[PDB]
Symmetry: D2
Subunit: 380 residues, 4 copies
């Protein structure tokens, strides 16, 4: 009755994640001055280049040079020896206003609570009782491995580390009436950019002893656990020099690591009127509320929207057999307890607050008690 | 016992899909001359701009100006009145060689069958017997609605249409022992870019009568079906002028429309050594082989890889309760019948052939009898 | 005793001149809000692209998209059929603050009158009594031919004209004691971008009859005058699509058409602290004052500066033998009547006023009674 | 009877000169493979960015990444501490084919000797017997000061130097029957980018003792000579980070430093069919031939062209009163001894040879016995 499942995560300096963090730094900069800024900022990164492309209508005055470079500084790309430097890279801006055709169809002259969805689309929320975070263990572990790398880089204990990293965790699970129970870690991959001087065996030893053993409980690790540590053998070239980055190319890392489902919308660089972000956050909030409220052990929530229409087109609940209530009963509970219009979600989840850069690495869910991580007490 | 499920699709001129098609036009151009080209081409589109960013190591001599502009021409952006013109747009190129650190870790000096995966990652394949295409009805219908729009644009019957479109279909389903049975279409959204002269009622009438009724069987449509046709009210500004596009931002449209699962990897712009594409195609091939072979009615396949390692790290089969065989038995059948090393997949699926631009709109699966859509006869 | 001399001019839609006008539109936009803006804006134009690159420190909030596109609109590039369209081109911005090392060395904490030169360099002013404009006839005629083309394009009498044009005029001169006396026009070149439908003979006839004869006095034209009208035979592709443009690549067209001398500094995109512009304008003002004041018939003025130093390093006067006073006496007159510190020039010539876009085609000198064209009454 | 005259030069790492050298590195790369390449390559430089924009029709396969980065390496921008790094900067390419309308009008189906001029324009050549180089002393000295800085940077004796430098020299002259005789150096400016650690007095002392005294004969220097050494006080930020660069923005530095005249055409990035380069080189060759041949002491030559026309429209000779022959007699000598069609100049001056990057700093004239610097023996 056992099965394997694998999830990955990436570090702050992974080129796609650089772009997500920059896009959200831009969003936060606008929101600091104009809580109602309309923001759709994509970022592209390649050798020596950050390009901002998209649509922003805002009363803010934002110094894009400063904002972008400070985000890259935070990540740790501060010298040409590392392959990228915030001080000397190119920052190019191709930002126009929001289309007035979109603006008139979505929000102009509308009461805030009755703003239309900013686009069509579908979104999913998921929660699982297998961890206190209500997240899959596979991705929780994958994120923590990248966070550990960044910690040891920043505190100087592994000064050969660079910011670009990836991890991948395969867990063997059993199932119990639709819920999932982690048994052991089957395989771990870690690849991380490094300096020219450190040798491969020193890196592999450090990744096992100072990273894996520091993060993963020993009860999950055994003689049979497979380790692929620096499996390429050499990773000196990294960041955008090694691989182009784009915003919204880590959408599964941002969410549930292959578990649950995804509707395809990226989060970063978007204000609350973009339901790709606000409704996915709300859907997580619903899912987590159902599990922490004791109605399910595991649950998937779908919602969908049409551009210009406030209420969701569809809502669906899938409980994997882990509730005594029918899925229809859970749907009725959700409909009685949540208002999933974007102009109400914004109020419930405080989505005009400039906290988005903090969401843009290590997953949007399962950490930091953001509003969508604080369960709603349900009435039924 | 009924539930709703929603999927979307986008047209050829949707700015993200423009980028996928350009990236794959670039890939095909390289493969026409050098079957072993290493290609990782991202495309970004905004007002007046196509930017190519990424890594290509190839013996081909490719005229990027010509290749990009011809792809945009095919899509139909051929005049400033439409918001974008292949003849006069900017084409910018930021393409470097593949990192030699990646090359040495993945493919240099390796026997082709034993080439390492081009990256780590996870991938899923899915198949469902609800349609002959072995695809969810929701996304099949969504794709066909966009294809219909392009057909009526190109044949001149709706000359006010422009290339940028989106559709979304919500189907009410029942379930039968883990399989799903479509009952009716609950809601349809269509948004499509249009000329300045046509009025809203003419468009809405045409979208119902010439698009929806031409595509969706009447047995699925009834008095209660909800239509959101041009719901924003005005969509004259479109294509990249209205919304920035990036490669790999329609990964759910490219695959299963929210059904099954996704590991996060984009397809377009990548040669076969990128397992994001080759192994996802293989996983579809496996899933479809299991369903057409009569072992399951519905099945999800996960695989995962480490950079530089040929064999998958993990393989998992989930049959939703729709097989008499256990998931472990199906896994054994898969392991006996498929070799999921990238250097074997390339041979089985003919992945050096320059057919990729054809995959880059209307989904990669469920059409055209591509090799991954021709079931393998299973021995067990 | 006769000789030939040739000068050229270009139209508003010549790609280099597009860039000069855009750079100066940006400067004017800043000056409208912040008279003390520090501006060093270069523009690059190629197919579908305007790129702004440079350094601006200003309290203004400038919408670069709007400013750039409005300048291109004014020029007349408004449709993909013309090769460039303000509505749909790419506008990319790579603008940073002025270097703080420059700012501290030039203007920070300095009394305005005692601001240092913004850079080192040399500059020349020139005037000649051969025309009332105090300009060489060769370039006056060349400019007027381009202005005529733009006039006939804009009033619809030659609707096949596009904005990109070049002209060149060769005049036969005699000399009289260092002054020059035009005798006849020896050769005229006109090349102008055109639509696909008009034939070559219609264009050549129109350029002779409606352009040349409308601009050049018949007394200068005879049986022997050589006409090279549309000499390439076909000029449908034009503007930035045909030829990349850059700011500051028409510095001889901007000034004296090969007569006098040039110190190499471009004018457009620069505020008054850049002595390339302010001191060259002042030098013209000096030269014109000497000729209109009756001291010379023709005169060349050199000045030069060091970055951070207010007073010119050198001043030189060359009168071609056309004064009864020695060059040393004229130099003394200039030193007694003009203060060529940039922080005084700014006051005398009103150089914080946003009139710069008007200078950026058809020459900076010899027209419109700008302040540097109004002679100073000299005391001696 | 004395006067001052000032000329400037810039170093290899001056951002405009970076662009000229890159443009000519691109030209040379094409010519190495295809002697008949048609090349019009502009370069733009700003923080972290080299952009190539222009038109190239060539049979060569050129790796623009490699070519650009190697040119920047040669200049010495190899670390983020210097403000720019060839290894990690962005290289963007916007290169299209030559316009076919230009190609058909200029060179297609034409006998090489009878190729038309690639454009209209005017050009000047100049020579002066005041130095053995036949160049003005002011600019010769200015160039040598920059060359000295680069020498002391590269040999490690002044390791605080960076590549970006400017110099300016003012010489007091007397005249003798139209020729000019240098008397003394009146003022020298040197500004050079430097590291954060060196102090201002150490730099000023080194610039006087190790640079000026090493280059300028002591006979020209006296108690009254004015030195402006690091006059801004601080120049740590430099190269493209401090100031945008463009190709063809140092046209007076490239030529005669304000002496003679200039027709406005840039040299770098252009093949021989662009008469801006080939005819200006030829005009220098003519001028130098007249002076070294003993006909003049100082001479200015003008030539001009029309696009598509092989022979020059006009030729003019101005000898400043320094010949016993009339200017008409010298013109007749020039016409009997030189064929100034571009398709003949190419043969006489060997202009398909890839030696152009070597021309792109320290002036195109007066050094290295390039073909246009080897006087032609005149018959008359
Ligand atoms: C392997 S690259 C993707 C494929 C790549 N675009 C190509 O040209 O083959 C994807 C990511 O893997 C990581 N990476 C880059 N170089 C690597 C190396 N030498 N070894 C292992 N991982 C690497 C970085 O995180 C990078 O963003
Ligand atoms: C709505 S836009 C995305 C949000 C947008 N970036 C913004 O600034 O608000 C996404 C897509 O919707 C479609 N779209 C663009 N303009 C639209 C309009 N006026 N009405 C409906 N759909 C539109 C296009 O397919 C476009 O790529
Ligand atoms: C001839 S182009 C310069 C050379 C060009 N970059 C090349 O690739 O050969 C310079 C200018 O000449 C004009 N021009 C462009 N196409 C032309 C044509 N077909 N005939 C005549 N003049 C043209 C435009 O004003 C353009 O900016
Ligand atoms: C002074 S900058 C030109 C004006 C500048 N674009 C601005 O924003 O004010 C021109 C050149 O002077 C030199 N330069 C740059 N920074 C300097 C400084 N702090 N001191 C002296 N010269 C400098 C470099 O050679 C640079 O290319
Ligand atoms: K989702
Ligand atoms: K990538
Ligand atoms: K997948
Ligand atoms: K977008
Ligand atoms: K000047
Ligand atoms: K050009
Ligand atoms: K010249
Ligand atoms: K500049
Ligand atoms: Mg990626
Ligand atoms: Mg979407
Ligand atoms: Mg998108
Ligand atoms: Mg991936
Ligand atoms: Mg030009
Ligand atoms: Mg200058
Ligand atoms: Mg400059
Ligand atoms: Mg020219």
């Amino acid at each position: 009755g056992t099965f394997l499942f694998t999830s990955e995560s990436v570090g702050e300096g992974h080129p796609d994640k650089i772009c997500d963090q920059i896009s959200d730094a831009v969003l936060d900069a606008h929101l600091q001055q104009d809580p109602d800024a309309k923001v759709a900022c994509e970022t592209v990164a390649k050798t020596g280049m950050i390009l901002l492309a998209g649509e922003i209508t805002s009363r803010a005055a934002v110094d894009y040079q400063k904002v972008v470079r400070e985000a890259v500084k935070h990540i740790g790309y501060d010298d040409s020896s590392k392959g990228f430097d915030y001080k000397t890279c190119n920052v190019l801006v191709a930002l126009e206003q929001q289309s007035p055709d979109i603006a008139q169809g979505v929000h102009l002259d509308r009461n805030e609570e009755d703003i239309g969805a900013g686009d069509q689309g579908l979104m999913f929320g998921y929660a699982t009782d297998e961890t206190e975070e209500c997240m899959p263990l596979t991705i929780v572990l994958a994120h923590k491995l990248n966070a550990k790398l960044a910690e040891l880089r920043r505190n100087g204990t592994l000064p050969w580390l660079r910011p670009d990293s990836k991890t991948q965790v395969t867990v063997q699970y059993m199932q119990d009436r639709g819920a999932v129970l982690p048994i052991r870690v089957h395989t771990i991959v870690i690849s991380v950019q490094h300096d020219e001087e450190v040798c491969l065996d020193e890196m592999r030893d450090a990744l096992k002893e100072k990273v894996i053993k520091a993060v993963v409980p020993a009860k999950y690790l055994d003689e049979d656990t497979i380790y692929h540590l620096q499996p390429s053998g050499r990773f000196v070239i990294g960041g955008p020099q090694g691989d182009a980055g784009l915003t919204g190319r880590k959408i599964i890392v941002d969410t549930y690591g292959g578990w649950g489902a995804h509707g395809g919308g990226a989060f970063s660089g978007k204000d609350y009127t973009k339901v790709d972000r606000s409704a996915a956050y709300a859907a997580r909030w619903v899912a987590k509320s159902l599990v922490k409220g004791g109605l399910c052990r595991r649950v998937l929530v779908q919602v969908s929207y049409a551009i210009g229409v406030s209420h969701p087109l569809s809502i669906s609940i899938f409980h994997y057999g882990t509730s005594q209530k029918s899925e229809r009963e859970l749907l009725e509970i959700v409909k009685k307890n949540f208002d999933l219009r974007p102009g109400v979600i914004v109020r419930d989840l405080d989505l005009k607050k400039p906290i988005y850069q903090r969401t843009a690495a290590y997953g949007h869910f399962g950490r930091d008690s953001f509003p969508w991580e604080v369960p709603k007490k349900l009435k039924y």
